[PDB]
Design a protein around this nucleic acid. Sequence first.
RNA 1: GAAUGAUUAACACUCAUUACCA
RNA 2: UAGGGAAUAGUUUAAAAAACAUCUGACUCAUAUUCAGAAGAUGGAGGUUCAAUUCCUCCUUCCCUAACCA
RNA 3: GCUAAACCUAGCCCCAAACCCACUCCACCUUACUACCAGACAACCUUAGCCAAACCAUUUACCCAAAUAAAGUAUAGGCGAUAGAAAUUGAAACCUGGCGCAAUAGAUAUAGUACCGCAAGGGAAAGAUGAAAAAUUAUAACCAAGCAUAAUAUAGCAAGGACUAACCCCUAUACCUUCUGCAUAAUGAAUUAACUAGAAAUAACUUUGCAAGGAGAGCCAAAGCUAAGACCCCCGAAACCAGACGAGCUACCUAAGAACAGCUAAAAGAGCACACCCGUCUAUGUAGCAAAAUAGUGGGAAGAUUUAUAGGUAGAGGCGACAAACCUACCGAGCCUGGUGAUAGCUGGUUGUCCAAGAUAGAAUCUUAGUUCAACUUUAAAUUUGCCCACAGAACCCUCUAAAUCCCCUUGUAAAUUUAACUGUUAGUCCAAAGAGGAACAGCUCUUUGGACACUAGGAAAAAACCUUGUAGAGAGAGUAAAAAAUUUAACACCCAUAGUAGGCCUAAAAGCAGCCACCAAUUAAGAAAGCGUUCAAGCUCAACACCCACUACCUAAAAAAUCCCAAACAUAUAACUGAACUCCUCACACCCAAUUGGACCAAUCUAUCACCCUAUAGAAGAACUAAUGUUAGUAUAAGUAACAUGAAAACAUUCUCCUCCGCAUAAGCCUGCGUCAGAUUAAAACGAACUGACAAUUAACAGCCCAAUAUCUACAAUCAACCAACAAGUCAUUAUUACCCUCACUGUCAACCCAACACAGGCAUGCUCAUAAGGAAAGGUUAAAAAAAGUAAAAGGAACUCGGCAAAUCUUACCCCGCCUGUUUACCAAAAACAUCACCUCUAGCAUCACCAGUAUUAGAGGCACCGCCUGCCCAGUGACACAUGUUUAACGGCCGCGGUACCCUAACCGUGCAAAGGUAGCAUAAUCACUUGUUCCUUAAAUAGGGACCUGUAUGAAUGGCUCCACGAGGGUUCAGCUGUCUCUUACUUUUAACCAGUGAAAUUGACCUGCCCGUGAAGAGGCGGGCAUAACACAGCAAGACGAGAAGACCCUAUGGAGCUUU
RNA 4: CUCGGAGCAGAACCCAACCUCCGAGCAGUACAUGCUAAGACUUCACCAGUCAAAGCGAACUACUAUACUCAAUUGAUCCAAUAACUUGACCAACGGAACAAGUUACCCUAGGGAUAACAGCGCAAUCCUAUUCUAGAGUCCAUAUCAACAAUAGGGUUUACGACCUCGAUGUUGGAUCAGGACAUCCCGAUGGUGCAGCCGCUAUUAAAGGUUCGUUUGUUCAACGAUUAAAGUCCUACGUGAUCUGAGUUCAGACCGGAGUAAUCCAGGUCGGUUUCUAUCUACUUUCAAAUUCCUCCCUGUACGAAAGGACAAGAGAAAUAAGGCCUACUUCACAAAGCGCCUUCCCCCGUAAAUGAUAUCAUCUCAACUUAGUAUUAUACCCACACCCACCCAAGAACAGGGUUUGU
RNA 5: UAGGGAAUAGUUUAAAAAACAGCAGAUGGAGGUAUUCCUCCUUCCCUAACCA
Length: 116
Amino acid sequence: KKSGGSSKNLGGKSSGRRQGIKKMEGHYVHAGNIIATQRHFRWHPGAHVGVGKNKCLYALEEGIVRYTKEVYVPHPRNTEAVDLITRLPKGAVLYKTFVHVVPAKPEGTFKLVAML
RNA sequence: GAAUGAUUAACACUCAUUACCA
RNA sequence: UAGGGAAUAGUUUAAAAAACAUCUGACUCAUAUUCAGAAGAUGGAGGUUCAAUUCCUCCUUCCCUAACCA
RNA sequence: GCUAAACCUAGCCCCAAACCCACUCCACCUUACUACCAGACAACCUUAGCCAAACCAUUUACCCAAAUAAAGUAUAGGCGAUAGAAAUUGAAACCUGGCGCAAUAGAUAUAGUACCGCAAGGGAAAGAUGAAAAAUUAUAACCAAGCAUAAUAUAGCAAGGACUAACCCCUAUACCUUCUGCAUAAUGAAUUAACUAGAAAUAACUUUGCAAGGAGAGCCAAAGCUAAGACCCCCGAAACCAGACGAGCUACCUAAGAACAGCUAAAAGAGCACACCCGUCUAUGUAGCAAAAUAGUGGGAAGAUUUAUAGGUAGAGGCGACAAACCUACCGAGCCUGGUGAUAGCUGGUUGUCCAAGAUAGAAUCUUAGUUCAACUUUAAAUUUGCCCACAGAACCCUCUAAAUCCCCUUGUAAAUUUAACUGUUAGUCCAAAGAGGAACAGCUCUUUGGACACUAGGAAAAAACCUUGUAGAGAGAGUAAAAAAUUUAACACCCAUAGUAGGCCUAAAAGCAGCCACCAAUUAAGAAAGCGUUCAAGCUCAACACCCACUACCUAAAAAAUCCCAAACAUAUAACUGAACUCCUCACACCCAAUUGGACCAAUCUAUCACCCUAUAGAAGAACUAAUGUUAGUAUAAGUAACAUGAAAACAUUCUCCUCCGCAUAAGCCUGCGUCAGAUUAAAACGAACUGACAAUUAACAGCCCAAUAUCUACAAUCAACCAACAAGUCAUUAUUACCCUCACUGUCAACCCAACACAGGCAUGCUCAUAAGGAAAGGUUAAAAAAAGUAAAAGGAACUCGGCAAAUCUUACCCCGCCUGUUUACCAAAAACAUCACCUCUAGCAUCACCAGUAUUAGAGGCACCGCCUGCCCAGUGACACAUGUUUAACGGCCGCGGUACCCUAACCGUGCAAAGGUAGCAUAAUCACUUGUUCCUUAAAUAGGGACCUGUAUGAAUGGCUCCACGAGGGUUCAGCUGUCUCUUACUUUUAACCAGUGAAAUUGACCUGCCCGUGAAGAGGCGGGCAUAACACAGCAAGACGAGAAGACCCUAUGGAGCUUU
RNA sequence: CUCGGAGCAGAACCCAACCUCCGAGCAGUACAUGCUAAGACUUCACCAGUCAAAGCGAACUACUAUACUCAAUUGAUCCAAUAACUUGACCAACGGAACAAGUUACCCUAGGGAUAACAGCGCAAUCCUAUUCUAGAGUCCAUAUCAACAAUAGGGUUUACGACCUCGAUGUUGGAUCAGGACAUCCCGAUGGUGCAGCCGCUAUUAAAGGUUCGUUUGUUCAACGAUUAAAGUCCUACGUGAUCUGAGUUCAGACCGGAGUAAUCCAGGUCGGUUUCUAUCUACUUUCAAAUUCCUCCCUGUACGAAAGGACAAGAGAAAUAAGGCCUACUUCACAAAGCGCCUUCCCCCGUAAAUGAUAUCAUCUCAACUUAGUAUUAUACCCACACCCACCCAAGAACAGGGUUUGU
RNA sequence: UAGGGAAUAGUUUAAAAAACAGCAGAUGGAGGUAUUCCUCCUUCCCUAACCA
Ligand SMILES: [K+]
Ligand SMILES: [K+]
Ligand SMILES: [K+]
Ligand SMILES: [K+]
Ligand SMILES: [K+]
Ligand SMILES: [K+]
Ligand SMILES: [K+]
Ligand SMILES: [K+]
Ligand SMILES: [K+]
Ligand SMILES: [K+]
Ligand SMILES: [K+]
Ligand SMILES: [K+]
Ligand SMILES: [K+]
Ligand SMILES: [K+]
Ligand SMILES: [K+]
Ligand SMILES: [K+]
Ligand SMILES: [K+]
Ligand SMILES: [K+]
Ligand SMILES: [K+]
Ligand SMILES: [K+]
Ligand SMILES: [K+]
Ligand SMILES: [K+]
Ligand SMILES: [K+]
Ligand SMILES: [K+]
Ligand SMILES: [K+]
Ligand SMILES: [K+]
Ligand SMILES: [K+]
Ligand SMILES: [Mg+2]
Ligand SMILES: [Mg+2]
Ligand SMILES: [Mg+2]
Ligand SMILES: [Mg+2]
Ligand SMILES: [Mg+2]
Ligand SMILES: [Mg+2]
Ligand SMILES: [Mg+2]
Ligand SMILES: [Mg+2]
Ligand SMILES: [Mg+2]
Ligand SMILES: [Mg+2]
Ligand SMILES: [Mg+2]
Ligand SMILES: [Mg+2]
Ligand SMILES: [Mg+2]
Ligand SMILES: [Mg+2]
Ligand SMILES: [Mg+2]
Ligand SMILES: [Mg+2]
Ligand SMILES: [Mg+2]
Ligand SMILES: [Mg+2]
Ligand SMILES: [Mg+2]
Ligand SMILES: [Mg+2]
Ligand SMILES: [Mg+2]
Ligand SMILES: [Mg+2]
Ligand SMILES: [Mg+2]
Ligand SMILES: [Mg+2]
Ligand SMILES: [Mg+2]
Ligand SMILES: [Mg+2]
Ligand SMILES: [Mg+2]
Ligand SMILES: [Mg+2]
Ligand SMILES: [Mg+2]
Ligand SMILES: [Mg+2]
Ligand SMILES: [Mg+2]
Ligand SMILES: [Mg+2]
Ligand SMILES: [Mg+2]
Ligand SMILES: [Mg+2]
Ligand SMILES: [Mg+2]
Ligand SMILES: [Mg+2]
Ligand SMILES: [Mg+2]
Ligand SMILES: [Mg+2]
Ligand SMILES: [Mg+2]
Ligand SMILES: [Mg+2]
Ligand SMILES: [Mg+2]
Ligand SMILES: [Mg+2]
Ligand SMILES: [Mg+2]
Ligand SMILES: [Mg+2]
Ligand SMILES: [Mg+2]
Ligand SMILES: [Mg+2]
Ligand SMILES: [Mg+2]
Ligand SMILES: [Mg+2]
Ligand SMILES: [Mg+2]
Ligand SMILES: [Mg+2]
Ligand SMILES: [Mg+2]
Ligand SMILES: [Mg+2]
Ligand SMILES: [Mg+2]
Ligand SMILES: [Mg+2]
Ligand SMILES: [Mg+2]
Ligand SMILES: [Mg+2]
Ligand SMILES: [Mg+2]
Ligand SMILES: [Mg+2]
Ligand SMILES: [Mg+2]
Ligand SMILES: [Mg+2]
Ligand SMILES: [Mg+2]
Ligand SMILES: [Mg+2]
Ligand SMILES: [Mg+2]
Ligand SMILES: [Mg+2]
Ligand SMILES: [Mg+2]
Ligand SMILES: [Mg+2]
Ligand SMILES: [Mg+2]
Ligand SMILES: [Mg+2]
Ligand SMILES: [Mg+2]
Ligand SMILES: [Mg+2]
Ligand SMILES: [Mg+2]
Ligand SMILES: [Mg+2]
Ligand SMILES: [Mg+2]
Ligand SMILES: [Mg+2]
Ligand SMILES: [Mg+2]
Ligand SMILES: [Mg+2]
Ligand SMILES: [Mg+2]
Ligand SMILES: [Mg+2]
Ligand SMILES: [Mg+2]
Ligand SMILES: [Mg+2]
Ligand SMILES: [Mg+2]
Ligand SMILES: [Mg+2]
Ligand SMILES: [Mg+2]
Ligand SMILES: [Mg+2]
Ligand SMILES: [Mg+2]
Ligand SMILES: [Mg+2]
Ligand SMILES: [Mg+2]
Ligand SMILES: [Mg+2]
Ligand SMILES: [Mg+2]
Ligand SMILES: [Mg+2]
Ligand SMILES: [Mg+2]
Ligand SMILES: [Mg+2]
Ligand SMILES: [Mg+2]
Ligand SMILES: [Mg+2]
Ligand SMILES: [Mg+2]
Ligand SMILES: [Mg+2]
Ligand SMILES: [Mg+2]
Ligand SMILES: [Mg+2]
Ligand SMILES: [Mg+2]
Ligand SMILES: [Mg+2]
Ligand SMILES: [Mg+2]
Ligand SMILES: [Mg+2]
Ligand SMILES: [Mg+2]
Ligand SMILES: [Mg+2]
Ligand SMILES: [Mg+2]
Ligand SMILES: [Mg+2]
Ligand SMILES: [Mg+2]
Ligand SMILES: [Mg+2]
Ligand SMILES: [Mg+2]
Ligand SMILES: [Mg+2]
Ligand SMILES: [Mg+2]
Ligand SMILES: [Mg+2]
């Protein structure tokens, strides 16, 4: 019985974050429902979709979730993204995946309240 | 260590040169 | 096989200094001692920091310890 | 037919009621049960711990004076576990009963007896007629295991299907527990009978009552509330604490006793050697003679000796020449009782029938042998989707542009979620697939997806994990599913060869063929040469011509293990057939998973009411046993086995043979225990009797049982006590005065005997006998096998045996290590080098009326070391102790060095430099001293890892936790000369025992059941029991030890447990 | 030992190893990092953690301004401090006990084959063997002999690995005793090759009937050494065999030395000492009756061979050892007999190859062509073989039983 | 962490001086009415904490 060695690799024991899409294409969401969670921007917020401080995407309106591909124009103040687009060959357009909520209900209705 | 010179009255030294198991 | 420590001038130590050794001079008839001068160093490689012997990392050499119970 | 079986009483339990309490005479706290004398001692003083807190450390309910209620409230608490009031409230109360037991129950109880223990203390078993036994030839019978009547016939979990037929044929791997998985060679179990194990709240559910109320004050209430039904086991540690009991064993001590021949020396912890004490070595023995013995051999035996008697020290302790010894057979700390039903996440066990549902992501945890939450699983309830899935849709960065997934209408289907209430599972195996670790090893380890297994059946030889197949019954129908192993191998050309030229160059030589360049040309045809060869050449081939139909294939290679190959066989008759619990068929249908969960029934018993040859509806409960190394009893198996016993003849008078270990007596112990008579009860055999009943008996002079007061007295051992010389300094003695006229009581007295469970080869003090005047018998009979035991003798050799000369024989030499010596120790595996010890040294203490001590520093106590001889070096920084102003102290705890260079190499008188309290000094050294190591050399042997003497840096020797020499001593360890021998070469013969046979008597462990073969294979991985073969009428007796993973002891090694205990400690 | 990122885990989520890599236990800027509140996420439970519309109050009409940048950057309850707000652990064993280390070989109990040591089994890295390949060595020459880089198989003796049976026990080294088996043969037999003249060797094929020594030191298995031998084989059998033995070693309780430790005590160390039970129920077995192996001497022969030196084989003869089976005349132990140290007997084959003839293929060719020879045994033969006289007696027969004799039953 | 106290030349003292160390040299820092009055901060000491 010879004495053995030991592994020099510590840590690495974190559990899965359980991130990803919570509401798939066509699903009905109420306002506030989290649509997806992510560590980096895999899906970008579209129409009526808010983005949390932790990049969490949530519904701003009640409706149907839709995923589309759209042209990506960064904010002129986002230095890193602007540096990329300026170095692109002319004629080249960046695309990204966006998630939207199509509002299902109208903001309200006018109802007869009195006959004065 | 060897040879060679330099050195000495001649040497030694020194310097320089050469070639099982429970 | 596992573990801890160390590496500084040619030599041996210190927190970039002393000691001698080495070279220079003086004293001696000459040598030593002595006196006055002079030079010389942070095992290797990589990185942090404006700056690293002094913060970390791997390798080499060496040392010390353990390597058991039926 | 035996053994047995059966019984209904004895009494007992729980309540009620009631307060309770004895007495002849005599004896009884001293040694209890003892007629009768001078004393004066006197009682109180907090429970602890197990356990719970998942350890444990504060803490952890224990009637304390009225049931209920307030209330598990206030409050307390590692604010944890758990503990827990009061104010206030306020009831009933008629002993003579029982849905209690009925001889393993109920009290332990026929009895606190027998029996066990020194003691405290522990503590049984069992009986059965009838009206009458002054009816006893009575009261029938049938029933457990075990046997008998009546042994057995190839073959195999002992049966099943069957059959004319018991067997023969075919099929079939006991049971429980425990596991991933057990025929397993894993656990338990000889068998029978009896006994022997699920206790309850919180909620919820079900069924009644009443209902915004319910309830027979308290409580609850936004349909509640009241009542009922229905769920929560048994045995087991090592421990801990309290109070008693123990020093008749043993350790040590106190008082007063006893023993020690002979010889040598005559001085002796001196030698030889009895008694006596001890226990070195070997054999025997190992449920024995013996819970430590016997035989031989050994150590001691005038001393630190051995030993009888009484007394002392007691468990948080004693005692100890320290062995963790010994303290009543078992002491890392006694025993008993109690706390106590200690606790156990650990093993084992857990009792009627039938059906149903039912296999598993993970998280935390002093946690991974367990728990809680999730998940899965079960039941009840609610109302609404569940599952399968169409498009569309879900990322860039990056190398496998993976198999897929997610989402999802339709559709095919019938589930799903939610509410209420719980338990169990949370120690996992193989296969396919994607990977990781390892060795692209594992029946290996780790994740993922799926399957199977832990449930069925068929198949793959046997076969958990592969294939086929699942839903349950009957059938002497039927169709099928999976389902059988194929292959066979290496020929090959014939014929012929002149030449520019030995091409050029290089080279000693290079001539087709060491290298470099060219590679042209003669002959119809032949490379300025493709393979050999020659030192260079020669020489043999191939590519050429001619001859001429070689008319090639151009794909490939073996083998070996251990008990014995392994179905038998077969190349030839027409695609089929066989084959399940699948499916069909006639009839029927709840009727094949562990843990767990739901449900339907039910034996017997008691009670209410029925019933009335053994029942019904209900209510109850000590309500069901193929398993706990279970408890008690009975009887088997081993087994008529192991083992045990009586000297001979005779007229039972006596005599003979042989032992003598003794023997007689006293003390202690014991208590009628071989005397008579009468019984046939019996001695490990036997009708004499030690057993039963009765009747007798031991007679004091021996011994025990003693003494008026007060004061006073007592320097001068003993040893033949005389010479002589001692130390350890000793067992023996009065007087004065007063008082005192009396007599022979009382008790022990036996034996073949005590302590050891026994009629035990053991233990057991003293006197005398010293081999006997006393006391005894080794052989039940026979035979004369093996193996075994105890002896005797042995050719030639003489340690060649062996770890070792163990044992035996003979009887001796020299040396080494350790310890000075005599002595002491682990009673029962160690007798030693361990302890003690004379000697030496350190430390403490200036003193009296209970040890030390009736002592006083030349003393006493606490320690170290270990006579003597030579010695005991350096260090006080650290720790300790002492001392105080620094400090002192090692024969206190302890310690006592590097790195680099210099005489060729080894080495360094030497030199540099750092460190320290000091740097290991003298000695000794391959050691009983870490390895290296069988170091080197001399001696020893034919040969030596042995032994002796040296050399040694031992970098881990070393100086009172002592170093080194040396006399004497040693059942210490090692070596050796000589001799001796059956130790051996190499065994043999005889005797005794045992043995075997006959007769009597008659155990133990063990035992699931057995109808109890061998081979290969298989398998929970080593098969009498499975597969394939082979073998095979039946049954004794004697041997053997290869297997039955043989018996015996719940492995002492190892790990685990929030299990113990002893010891040490900063 | 807690936390985060990446791979394993390629595409929703999840996913382990004492697996592979890299990090964290802060820092910086704000000071509305103010208040409040729909709807959601969630590390597979809980605890904890995460994102947020609207609204209030601010800011604001220049600020990718509105839950700050940032991946992790962290700690429950009780309790303590504090007027309040609020703060407090490398509680890092990081779901955290308010506070507790050693040692036990003097040990104990409960369990575990859920887990080690022995053996089996699995596996074959390691170990051993064979073949393939043709570099190299062997003067030349690959293949007499040896052999690199590699390749393909086999073996199951080593050291490991795994943890499947066994811990209500499968007794652990070496030796004694008795051996069963494999052949990968050490000796003896039969053959091919040789860098084989001969004598000796080397290598390969075949052969497991028979055989395979005694001693000094060591506990040894081994190893060294002495002396022999035809040879002193390699292995398996629970590293065969302790209900047959042994107990030197190893591995309990005593003790010493060196070393470690404050000590208790301890060490792969060394050293002295240290209890080895069992009456056999079952299986199996208790005359495989009887063919023998080997060395040496003489002779062949100083022949064959060879320059010499040296020096055979076959046949023949003799004498021994061992083994097996018997026996007692003598010797010896002994004495109506049993014994050895004495005497007597002992018998067949071995298949690897070497050669003819002769086809496929009109030569040739020893032929998994037909065939011929070396070249083979029904292994030979041997032993055993007739039986109610049998009460009893005797016995060279024997445990009992059985057997022989009794014409040897006063 | 809490308070108490303290800070003079490199060092240690005095009431702006001497002594040592190497003619230089100082009133820890900031603010205020100046070593000498007060306050905050730094460093250090003292004393008590450092629990959960
Ligand atoms: K997110
Ligand atoms: K405990
Ligand atoms: K009783
Ligand atoms: K069982
Ligand atoms: K088995
Ligand atoms: K098993
Ligand atoms: K067992
Ligand atoms: K006493
Ligand atoms: K068990
Ligand atoms: K547990
Ligand atoms: K099949
Ligand atoms: K040439
Ligand atoms: K008596
Ligand atoms: K005895
Ligand atoms: K002794
Ligand atoms: K000191
Ligand atoms: K020696
Ligand atoms: K020597
Ligand atoms: K002795
Ligand atoms: K046997
Ligand atoms: K923890
Ligand atoms: K392996
Ligand atoms: K075991
Ligand atoms: K020996
Ligand atoms: K059997
Ligand atoms: K004899
Ligand atoms: K041919
Ligand atoms: Mg990860
Ligand atoms: Mg994880
Ligand atoms: Mg001159
Ligand atoms: Mg507890
Ligand atoms: Mg404990
Ligand atoms: Mg009250
Ligand atoms: Mg009773
Ligand atoms: Mg019967
Ligand atoms: Mg059969
Ligand atoms: Mg198992
Ligand atoms: Mg099975
Ligand atoms: Mg069994
Ligand atoms: Mg078990
Ligand atoms: Mg209950
Ligand atoms: Mg306690
Ligand atoms: Mg007590
Ligand atoms: Mg006594
Ligand atoms: Mg006395
Ligand atoms: Mg005498
Ligand atoms: Mg004496
Ligand atoms: Mg004597
Ligand atoms: Mg004593
Ligand atoms: Mg001791
Ligand atoms: Mg001891
Ligand atoms: Mg006792
Ligand atoms: Mg219990
Ligand atoms: Mg079912
Ligand atoms: Mg914890
Ligand atoms: Mg678990
Ligand atoms: Mg759907
Ligand atoms: Mg789980
Ligand atoms: Mg596995
Ligand atoms: Mg030519
Ligand atoms: Mg030429
Ligand atoms: Mg040429
Ligand atoms: Mg030619
Ligand atoms: Mg040539
Ligand atoms: Mg031509
Ligand atoms: Mg040709
Ligand atoms: Mg069916
Ligand atoms: Mg059916
Ligand atoms: Mg009935
Ligand atoms: Mg019952
Ligand atoms: Mg029963
Ligand atoms: Mg039982
Ligand atoms: Mg018997
Ligand atoms: Mg007998
Ligand atoms: Mg008298
Ligand atoms: Mg008498
Ligand atoms: Mg005695
Ligand atoms: Mg007599
Ligand atoms: Mg007798
Ligand atoms: Mg007898
Ligand atoms: Mg007899
Ligand atoms: Mg003899
Ligand atoms: Mg010998
Ligand atoms: Mg001798
Ligand atoms: Mg021998
Ligand atoms: Mg002897
Ligand atoms: Mg002694
Ligand atoms: Mg003893
Ligand atoms: Mg004794
Ligand atoms: Mg003894
Ligand atoms: Mg001693
Ligand atoms: Mg002395
Ligand atoms: Mg000293
Ligand atoms: Mg030198
Ligand atoms: Mg010295
Ligand atoms: Mg040594
Ligand atoms: Mg010897
Ligand atoms: Mg030392
Ligand atoms: Mg010493
Ligand atoms: Mg000392
Ligand atoms: Mg003496
Ligand atoms: Mg001696
Ligand atoms: Mg003695
Ligand atoms: Mg017998
Ligand atoms: Mg008999
Ligand atoms: Mg048994
Ligand atoms: Mg088998
Ligand atoms: Mg028999
Ligand atoms: Mg069996
Ligand atoms: Mg056994
Ligand atoms: Mg056990
Ligand atoms: Mg405890
Ligand atoms: Mg969650
Ligand atoms: Mg807002
Ligand atoms: Mg934790
Ligand atoms: Mg966590
Ligand atoms: Mg010991
Ligand atoms: Mg045990
Ligand atoms: Mg296992
Ligand atoms: Mg093993
Ligand atoms: Mg086995
Ligand atoms: Mg293999
Ligand atoms: Mg060559
Ligand atoms: Mg094997
Ligand atoms: Mg496993
Ligand atoms: Mg067993
Ligand atoms: Mg054999
Ligand atoms: Mg062979
Ligand atoms: Mg063996
Ligand atoms: Mg055996
Ligand atoms: Mg021994
Ligand atoms: Mg020691
Ligand atoms: Mg002894
Ligand atoms: Mg020993
Ligand atoms: Mg034995
Ligand atoms: Mg026997
Ligand atoms: Mg011949
Ligand atoms: Mg021919
Ligand atoms: Mg021909």
